Structure 1
Amino acid sequence: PRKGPVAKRDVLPDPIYNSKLVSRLINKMMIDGKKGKSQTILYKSFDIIKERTGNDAMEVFEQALKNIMPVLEVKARRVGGANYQVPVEVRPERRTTLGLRWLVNYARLRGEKTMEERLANEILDAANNTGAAVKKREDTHKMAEANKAFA
């Protein structure tokens, strides 16, 4: 808004892992204010991570974020009669936001039947430095570096 920056509302950390970083994810995944369903999926998905790997799910999840979270993004800019996608440094706050959004979005587009599996499988893919949410982070970087000229 015009007046200035606004007080960013805080979320509580969570009754298992004690993680603000992962309460956010319930809220990204939540639909129609059904927080229970999203909690259930999350927690089920994290069990599935722990069984397949052996490592702590939280850990794999935070490894996964690092690979999904972008650093540079282009931004649409009309100058004259042609657009110049201008590269910008992503703010630390926005990095997480784009991290979780892409995780949740591309999780839902997977072909696995249940969401807990789709989420889990997508979280594992990011840790493997491949998948859809990673390919998104690759493609945002490619565009940013392609338009490195501008500043």
Structure 2
Amino acid sequence: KGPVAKRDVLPDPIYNSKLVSRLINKMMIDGKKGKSQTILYKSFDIIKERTGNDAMEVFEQALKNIMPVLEVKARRVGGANYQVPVEVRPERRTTLGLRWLVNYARLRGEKTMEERLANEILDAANNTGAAVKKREDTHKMAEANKAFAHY
């Protein structure tokens, strides 16, 4: 066996970014990529409107904040069910950040996914945020499981 390759589509006129393209690929339901594209466009527009700054930098800072450095992987060595901290590769970090962003944004609850994602990007740029709660919990678990930094 072994790993496998893959690729995506970068070009996006509204805040061109490969991570933005990956996010667009995410949050998509029922094969409706157009809905996700429109939602992301309108959310970035609302961000640019409310905050006098380019949404690209805000999104980058939100990703830098939510990205988890250490992952806590379970492992059952005997009747103990231990856990092992793990160093997350940048790809897995970005994917986990996207997952948490989307999930907690849709979990927040507002009148529109656009406003939900906008407020989530804001509460991510400002470390105080839902996805950052998940980040902090994961970091706490990794710290508590530091005893198994390496087998």
Fold agreement, TM-score > 0.5 = yes
Secondary structure in structure 2 of the residue aligned to 1:85: strand
Deviation (angstroms), 1:23 = 0.7
8 Å contact 2:69–2:93 — kept in the other structure? Answer: yes
Aligned equivalent of 1:84, options 63, 82, 85: 82
Cα separation, 1, equivalents of 2:46 and 2:81: 45
Deviation (angstroms), 1:133 = 0.3
**Cα deviation code 1:103-143 (max 9, x no counterpart):** 00000001211000000000000111111101101110000
Could you list the runs of 4 or more consecutive aligned residues of structure 1 that deviate by over 4 angstroms after TM superposition? none
Deviation (angstroms), 1:51 = 1.3
Cα separation, 1, equivalents of 2:65 and 2:79: 36
Secondary structure in structure 1 of the residue aligned to 2:75: coil
Cα separation, 1, equivalents of 2:35 and 2:103: 17
Secondary structure in structure 2 of the residue aligned to 1:138: helix
Cα separation, 2, equivalents of 1:76 and 1:122: 29
Aligned equivalent of 2:126, options 121, 128, 134: 128
Farther off after superposition, 14-23 or 70-79: 14-23
Secondary structure in structure 1 of the residue aligned to 2:26: helix
CA RMSD of aligned residues (A): 0.9
Identity in percent: 100
**Cα deviation code 1:53-87 (max 9, x no counterpart):** 11101111111111111000100100001111110
Number of residue-to-residue matches in the alignment: 149
Farther off after superposition, 95-104 or 3-12: 3-12
Q: TM-score if structure 2 supplies the norm length? A: 0.95
Cα separation, 1, equivalents of 2:141 and 2:9: 33
Deviation (angstroms), 1:16 = 2.4
Deviation (angstroms), 1:10 = 2.8
**Partner residue, 1:107:** 105
Give 5+ residue unaligned stretches, structure 1.
none
Secondary structure in structure 2 of the residue aligned to 1:141: helix
Cα separation, 1, equivalents of 2:127 and 2:38: 27
